[PDB]
Amino acid sequence: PHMSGLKKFFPYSTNVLKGAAADIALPSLAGKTVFFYFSASWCPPCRAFTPQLIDFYKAHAEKKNFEVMLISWDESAEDFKDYYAKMPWLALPFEDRKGMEFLTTGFDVKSIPTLVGVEADSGNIITTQARTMVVKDPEAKDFPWPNVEAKK
Incomplete structure (x- = not known):
């Protein structure tokens, strides 16, 4: 139970963020679907889609057993802090910029907002068009x- 599959997505971070705490480790995501949310506060459609995703999260995160993780395209640490503060889910730490680059190219993310679903246990991909x-x-x-x- 090392979460090997999920670990493949994080060459440069061990634990991730959950609000003010940054001690969230991967095993806590065992058995779940995990969505990588590529977003930024400078992006108008992101600013509007975020509240829609929060509504979906409130309605289904528990019963459908999933978690969301922000992968930020923000310009500065300040912008990241203010934007992530509005969110109830996880985040890849802003300081791990190379990790954000790894995921962005891995999934061929060319615009935002984008939402990618993965299986925590196997590490397999479900879709990039969530x-x-x-x-x-x-x-x-x-x-x-x-x-x-x-x-089509």
């Missing part, structure tokens, strides 16, 4: 939406 489905399927009927990419 943003679309938070909006289209607010009741989470088809969650966690594998292969949204199949769509």
